[PDB]
Design a protein around this motif. Structure first.
Motif, mmCIF file in Angstrom:
data_model
loop_
_atom_site.group_PDB
_atom_site.id
_atom_site.type_symbol
_atom_site.label_atom_id
_atom_site.label_comp_id
_atom_site.label_asym_id
_atom_site.label_seq_id
_atom_site.Cartn_x
_atom_site.Cartn_y
_atom_site.Cartn_z
ATOM 1 N N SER A 97 -1.181 -67.562 -29.797
ATOM 2 C CA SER A 97 -0.461 -66.821 -28.774
ATOM 3 C C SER A 97 -1.368 -65.744 -28.200
ATOM 4 O O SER A 97 -2.066 -65.047 -28.943
ATOM 5 N N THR A 98 -1.357 -65.616 -26.876
ATOM 6 C CA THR A 98 -2.182 -64.643 -26.175
ATOM 7 C C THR A 98 -1.292 -63.780 -25.295
ATOM 8 O O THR A 98 -0.505 -64.305 -24.500
ATOM 9 N N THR A 99 -1.418 -62.464 -25.437
ATOM 10 C CA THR A 99 -0.626 -61.518 -24.663
ATOM 11 C C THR A 99 -1.387 -61.126 -23.402
ATOM 12 O O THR A 99 -2.525 -60.653 -23.480
ATOM 13 N N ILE A 100 -0.757 -61.321 -22.247
ATOM 14 C CA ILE A 100 -1.325 -60.959 -20.954
ATOM 15 C C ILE A 100 -0.495 -59.813 -20.397
ATOM 16 O O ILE A 100 0.693 -59.986 -20.099
ATOM 17 N N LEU A 155 -6.746 -65.938 -15.522
ATOM 18 C CA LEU A 155 -6.662 -64.522 -15.862
ATOM 19 C C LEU A 155 -7.483 -64.199 -17.105
ATOM 20 O O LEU A 155 -8.114 -63.138 -17.180
ATOM 21 N N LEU A 156 -7.490 -65.102 -18.090
ATOM 22 C CA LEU A 156 -8.261 -64.856 -19.304
ATOM 23 C C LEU A 156 -9.759 -64.980 -19.056
ATOM 24 O O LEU A 156 -10.547 -64.257 -19.677
ATOM 25 N N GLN A 157 -10.171 -65.881 -18.163
ATOM 26 C CA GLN A 157 -11.587 -65.996 -17.831
ATOM 27 C C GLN A 157 -12.045 -64.845 -16.946
ATOM 28 O O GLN A 157 -13.176 -64.365 -17.083
ATOM 29 N N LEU A 158 -11.183 -64.392 -16.033
ATOM 30 C CA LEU A 158 -11.500 -63.205 -15.246
ATOM 31 C C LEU A 158 -11.629 -61.980 -16.141
ATOM 32 O O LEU A 158 -12.457 -61.098 -15.887
ATOM 33 N N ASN A 159 -10.820 -61.913 -17.202
ATOM 34 C CA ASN A 159 -10.928 -60.814 -18.154
ATOM 35 C C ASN A 159 -12.225 -60.896 -18.949
ATOM 36 O O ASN A 159 -12.890 -59.878 -19.170
ATOM 37 N N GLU A 160 -12.603 -62.102 -19.384
ATOM 38 C CA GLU A 160 -13.852 -62.268 -20.120
ATOM 39 C C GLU A 160 -15.065 -62.021 -19.232
ATOM 40 O O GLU A 160 -16.080 -61.494 -19.704
ATOM 41 N N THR A 161 -14.980 -62.382 -17.950
ATOM 42 C CA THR A 161 -16.090 -62.134 -17.036
ATOM 43 C C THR A 161 -16.271 -60.643 -16.775
ATOM 44 O O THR A 161 -17.402 -60.145 -16.751
ATOM 45 N N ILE A 162 -15.169 -59.914 -16.590
ATOM 46 C CA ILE A 162 -15.258 -58.487 -16.288
ATOM 47 C C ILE A 162 -15.847 -57.721 -17.468
ATOM 48 O O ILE A 162 -16.660 -56.806 -17.286
ATOM 49 N N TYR A 163 -15.462 -58.087 -18.692
ATOM 50 C CA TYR A 163 -15.989 -57.407 -19.872
ATOM 51 C C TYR A 163 -17.486 -57.648 -20.031
ATOM 52 O O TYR A 163 -18.270 -56.699 -20.146
ATOM 53 N N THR A 164 -17.903 -58.918 -20.038
ATOM 54 C CA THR A 164 -19.299 -59.239 -20.316
ATOM 55 C C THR A 164 -20.227 -58.782 -19.198
ATOM 56 O O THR A 164 -21.389 -58.450 -19.460
HETATM 57 C C1 NAG Z 1 -10.407 -59.624 -22.605
HETATM 58 O O1 NAG Z 1 -11.733 -59.773 -23.122
HETATM 59 C C2 NAG Z 1 -12.023 -58.938 -24.256
HETATM 60 C C3 NAG Z 1 -13.462 -59.205 -24.627
HETATM 61 O O2 NAG Z 1 -13.560 -60.098 -25.728
HETATM 62 C C4 NAG Z 1 -11.050 -59.232 -25.397
HETATM 63 O O3 NAG Z 1 -11.286 -58.320 -26.463
HETATM 64 C C5 NAG Z 1 -9.611 -59.109 -24.914
HETATM 65 O O4 NAG Z 1 -8.715 -59.509 -25.945
HETATM 66 C C6 NAG Z 1 -9.394 -59.983 -23.685
HETATM 67 N N1 NAG Z 1 -8.031 -59.853 -23.196
HETATM 68 C C7 NAG Z 1 -7.142 -60.850 -23.257
HETATM 69 C C8 NAG Z 1 -5.779 -60.549 -22.710
HETATM 70 O O5 NAG Z 1 -7.425 -61.945 -23.733
#
Ligand code: NAG
Ligand code: CXQ
Ligand code: CXQ
Ligand code: CXQ
Ligand code: CXQ
Ligand code: CXQ
Ligand code: CXQ
Ligand code: NAG
Ligand code: NAG
Ligand code: NAG
Ligand code: NAG
Ligand code: NAG
Ligand code: NAG
Ligand code: NAG
Ligand code: NAG
Ligand code: NAG
Ligand code: NAG
Ligand code: NAG
Ligand code: NAG
Ligand code: NAG
Ligand code: NAG
Lengths: 250, 129, 129, 129, 250, 250
Positions: free
Chosen positions: F163-166, F201-210
């Protein structure tokens, strides 16, 4: 004992139970099983606030109990109580979740006031129930409109709505020294007696307003009806004002 | 036993309300439907066969057994009175072996009788050689 | 199966309380009736047929299935265990077509047998011309 | 009547969860057992006989009657929908006198027929003197 | 699994279910269906507070569950817990509406004190239930008298009451380092051990009062019973005091 | 009307009821009676937060209602709402005792924010239910994960979990002027549109972080996806960042 059941036999209602039917008796659906709430009004009980409140009393040590019923009777008189102790604490518990007021009331007698309330819950002294919205209880809930009544269980064989709130003030509620006032406005009251009908109270209210007999100051004005003024069950049916803060309505 | 109304008065007419109401469009959707005050239908029953005055006396006489039932149950009650009545009805008739032609067995072999004694005329009538 | 008490001890007597109590006057009215502490009747059962020691072992062995039932239900449970047992009892016997003289049909045509084979002597005995 | 799926789409597979789980040791004890998240078993049903797409349409069409039932009941409801369905099932078959060989009586006297007409050859065959 | 059912066959109790009865078996009324609560006491478990509390423990993630039962057994030992955390917060939840204490207890062991309470709810470690008034729960409720027990379901075929409260104080409740004190008054205590029976505790209390062995100051006085003093199941059945604030009762 | 019942006849599912079965139909156990919760997802409804929230609305005067169901469907999209009014008060009621979130959700869309909330309870505008843990409700509960769905009743014949919380922020919730932001961290947000899938949304989140595109100050940074970026139902299936506090992700 076992809960009796009403069944129609020989063109008459009879009390029976599922264990004393005959093979001719046919129960083919739960739709034939019905619970009905009947109002004490229909049996000829006095419905005025002084008479009605005498049938209720406070008792501790008995948990409240609740039973469902599906159909009810249109009531002419219902009651809605907001009673406190002299120290300001509430006498009656808040209505549990999902308990709404009785749905059909021609006159809702809302009674606010004080009393000792020597008991945790208010019960019906004659064993009757307090009828709410499709729910019968053994106790009175705060600010929740109810009709007094009883429940019957049946085996069946195989018109605008208007409500008027009549507000009262009460002192010594519960005791045998209770006093009631009919509220015309927040500063004009009429000393209440058992013989005043709801129709008489509404006409006395309309007369006081149109005749300017309301209090025109900051103080409390209480009218008394002289015994010379008077006018069966609900289903079978030139005034002088001078002040004497008491007064008299002749 | 019969019902003897012993009340001071009887209102012979039952002006009643209930919630046993084909919906009109989207009125069944709780978001669009009526408020709590507008879910009731009304009806008027008269005292045919004295059923109304009998009903008032029945509800009055039900109270003691009903109160004693409520005292003995905990407010966490998990069964309904009318469903238990329905179950007891079935248990009274079918809770044991049904002995055909018995007083407690609700099985009528009527047509089954005049299907055997009717079709005896297939073996006693056909006795030729 | 049978019940084998495997407990360290057994109290062979059951001093029990319950609320399965003709009322005395106005004692049924909750306003006048007993307090919550005074609604109980008492009884004493002895170990005839070993029923008490068997009952203690039965309650012990019921726990696992009872706990697993409670885990799988939500505390908004809307059905009673004993009413569902009563319904399942009736469904086992009458949930399908009852084939007479079958092992799963609880219909005894005893008197119906000796009402046909008894009344054959109305057609075979009356064969005169 | 039949079920006609009129939805924009149908997911033909039902990946479902439930709590209809022999326990492993002390796992039935709530103190030692699983948390609330770990009481579920999973399964996967495919659209054999179109049951999944039919089920989705059935749940959709159940809503109106279900909502109207919930509007008419008070949230202090004391009966379950499925138990009442089970009771109504039994009342439909056994709520009255079962007339054998009738259309509303679920009693098959099959073997009872070929037990009488079979054993007629004990009185008509033994007619010698 | 499926909930087993007790039925009488061949003059003996047997476990069965409604799906494995024979046509001879007759269930003609729901009155034949009965739920009974049986006390762990009757199986020979140690009932002293140290032994009994070891059977309970705190756990999170498991919602509490509740089941009705109609008849219960008179208990010699019941328990009533008032436990807090060292920060003062309550360890046990308030009893839900309509859950009263177990109705028949010869001795109610009321235990007040503290502990870490590493868990949202207190469960029975052996899977048993906590028996309240016609209600069995998986968890302990605050200040609510209960008996440990289990529930059986049956198909039936077609003496004054006295209660004594014994009060205890506890530290380290729940842990494996729990200490218990028997409370004579608010300033006189006896260090508790498993072998002390309820009858011995009541006689030790009567001896301390009449002999003036209660604390006569403002401080706390704790007596210890020397191991030389001693005296089966509940159903089958010259003291010197000098102070050493500890002391010894020989 | 009467609640319909699903039964299998002629190798097909049919709607019927217990009163229109034939003697051939055999119901020998309550185990054959089953309630199932089916997700609106399976019918092809848009599951994005903007589309899904448009199906809900606030209404007063209608009490909430609740029905049990035994089995449910694994959901890809669930929702968990924490909405307040501009004055800070809660818009949604706390979940009643024993109502847990929907147990199987691949993506939980947690939405926090504000709105007028012109109504006591939030209902489903299309008459559907909000599915919780084996419980279907007509209203939304605060902070409780739910899936939209409907309930069916049946007569039966006689794979890791992640499960992933957005998280989202919302303004003008309920109105027809609602705005949504996808939360990357407490200071970095993306303006949300209906076409963004959970996987995007999860890939956009991973792209913004890295890529270090998170806000490196104390202020709020909101990214906008240019319409040139894009990529059926859930079951059948070189970025430049420059700031313009708005910005654009090409
Ligand atoms: C977004 O990316 C960061 C980097 O790994 C991660 O810690 C975070 O859980 C991500 N957010 C979601 C909602 O997956
Ligand atoms: C319009 N009403 C009328 C007839 C159908 C609808 C529902 C209501 O039902 C009555 C009733 C009683 C006997 C036969 C048919 C309808 C009714 C009263 C109390 C409880 C349930 C139903 C009265
Ligand atoms: C056929 N109906 C007609 C007359 C008998 C049967 C039942 C119905 O009346 C019911 C009733 C129940 C609850 C509210 C209103 C009507 C009824 C049954 C027994 C006694 C009086 C009325 C009307
Ligand atoms: C006829 N009764 C007598 C003996 C069997 C039947 C049932 C009753 O005892 C019940 C019982 C149930 C709950 C509390 C007290 C007694 C009983 C049934 C099975 C096993 C033991 C006792 C007494
Ligand atoms: C024998 N089973 C097989 C096929 C029919 C019968 C019932 C079961 O499927 C049920 C079901 C109910 C709830 C969750 C998952 C499966 C089922 C009944 C009707 C329509 C579809 C599925 C699998
Ligand atoms: C005075 N008591 C005695 C007999 C009637 C009254 C009620 C109580 O009932 C017993 C019982 C068991 C078997 C047969 C008759 C009475 C009883 C125990 C537990 C649960 C229900 C009833 C015992
Ligand atoms: C492992 N599961 C599988 C089979 C036993 C266990 C329990 C679950 O049960 C299904 C089922 C449906 C039809 C026949 C047998 C099992 C099931 C789905 C929904 C509701 C109840 C049961 C599926
Ligand atoms: C039933 O009627 C009798 C006679 O009118 C009355 O005395 C009694 O109080 C009534 N019972 C209830 C519960 O109202
Ligand atoms: C009625 O009130 C009077 C006070 O005047 C009091 O003395 C009397 O005890 C009361 N009666 C009852 C039955 O309470
Ligand atoms: C009358 O008094 C009540 C009670 O305080 C109050 O709520 C109400 O607003 C008052 N009405 C007027 C017109 O003053
Ligand atoms: C009393 O009369 C006034 C004047 O119209 C009206 O506004 C008020 O509602 C009346 N009170 C009641 C209880 O009917
Ligand atoms: C002022 O109030 C009195 C009651 O105190 C009322 O009777 C009178 O009519 C009012 N004044 C006038 C001029 O009418
Ligand atoms: C049942 O009895 C056995 C043996 O005495 C014991 O180990 C077990 O803990 C008991 N179960 C319960 C729930 O008390
Ligand atoms: C028992 O207590 C001791 C403290 O002396 C501790 O070291 C040990 O871990 C405890 N045992 C358990 C099983 O908690
Ligand atoms: C003993 O202490 C308790 C707990 O504070 C208190 O409630 C009670 O009144 C005290 N009793 C006496 C006699 O001091
Ligand atoms: C201890 O003895 C005293 C002296 O009579 C008594 O008042 C008190 O109740 C006793 N305590 C208990 C728990 O019995
Ligand atoms: C005073 O208290 C002590 C205990 O500390 C007790 O043993 C003693 O008897 C009391 N005083 C007298 C004079 O007895
Ligand atoms: C049932 O399906 C129809 C067609 O897809 C849809 O319009 C309706 O809103 C659905 N009902 C519910 C309660 O979802
Ligand atoms: C939609 O929002 C606009 C504001 O731009 C408003 O004027 C209009 O009334 C709204 N429509 C509805 C149906 O609420
Ligand atoms: C983000 O904000 C929320 C809401 O105030 C807060 O609970 C959380 O701790 C914050 N997280 C971080 C990493 O600052
Ligand atoms: C600092 O933040 C900006 C966004 O405002 C980000 O794009 C940039 O990469 C960060 N700094 C560096 C040196 O990358």
């Amino acid at each position: 004992r076992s809960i009796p059941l009403g069944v129609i036999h020989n063109s008459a209602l009879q009390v029976s139970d599922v264990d004393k039917l005959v093979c001719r008796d046919k129960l083919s659906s739960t739709n034939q099983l019905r619970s009905v709430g009947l109002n004490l009004e229909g049996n000829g009980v006095a419905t005025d606030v002084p008479s009605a409140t005498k049938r209720w009393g406070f008792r501790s040590g008995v948990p409240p109990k609740v039973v469902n019923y599906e159909a009810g009777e249109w009531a002419e008189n219902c009651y809605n109580l907001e009673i406190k102790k002299p120290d300001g604490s509430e006498c009656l518990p808040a209505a549990p979740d999902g308990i709404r007021g009785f749905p059909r009331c021609r006159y809702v007698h809302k009674v606010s006031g004080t009393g000792p309330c020597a008991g945790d819950f208010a019960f019906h002294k004659e064993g009757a129930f307090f009828l709410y919205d499709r729910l019968a209880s053994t106790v009175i809930y705060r600010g929740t409109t109810f009709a007094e009544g009883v429940v019957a269980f049946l085996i069946l064989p195989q018109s605008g709505y208007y409500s008027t709130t009549i507000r009262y003030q009460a002192t010594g509620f519960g005791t045998n020294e209770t006093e009631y006032l009919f509220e015309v406005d927040n500063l004009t009251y009429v000393q209440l007696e058992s013989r005043f009908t709801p129709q008489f109270l509404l006409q006395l209210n309309e007369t006081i307003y149109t005749s300017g007999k309301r209090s025109n100051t900051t103080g409390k004005l209480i009218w008394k009806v002289n015994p010379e003024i008077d006018t069966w069950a609900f289903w079978e049916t030139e005034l002088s004002f001078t002040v004497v803060x008491x007064x008299x309505x002749x | 036993e019969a019902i003897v109304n012993a009340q001071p008065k009887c209102n012979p007419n039952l002006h009643y309300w209930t919630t046993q109401d084909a919906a009109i469009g989207l009125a069944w959707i709780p978001y669009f439907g009526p408020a709590a005050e507008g879910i009731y239908i009304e009806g008027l029953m008269h005292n045919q066969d004295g059923l109304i005055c009998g009903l008032r006396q029945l509800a009055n006489e039900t109270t003691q057994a009903l109160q004693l039932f409520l005292r003995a149950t905990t407010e966490l009650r998990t069964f309904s009175i009318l469903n238990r009545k329905a179950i007891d009805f079935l248990l009274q008739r079918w809770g044991g072996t049904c002995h055909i032609l018995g007083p407690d067995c609700c099985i009528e072999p009527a047509d089954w009788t005049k299907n055997i004694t009717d079709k005896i005329d297939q073996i006693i009538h056909d006795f030729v050689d």
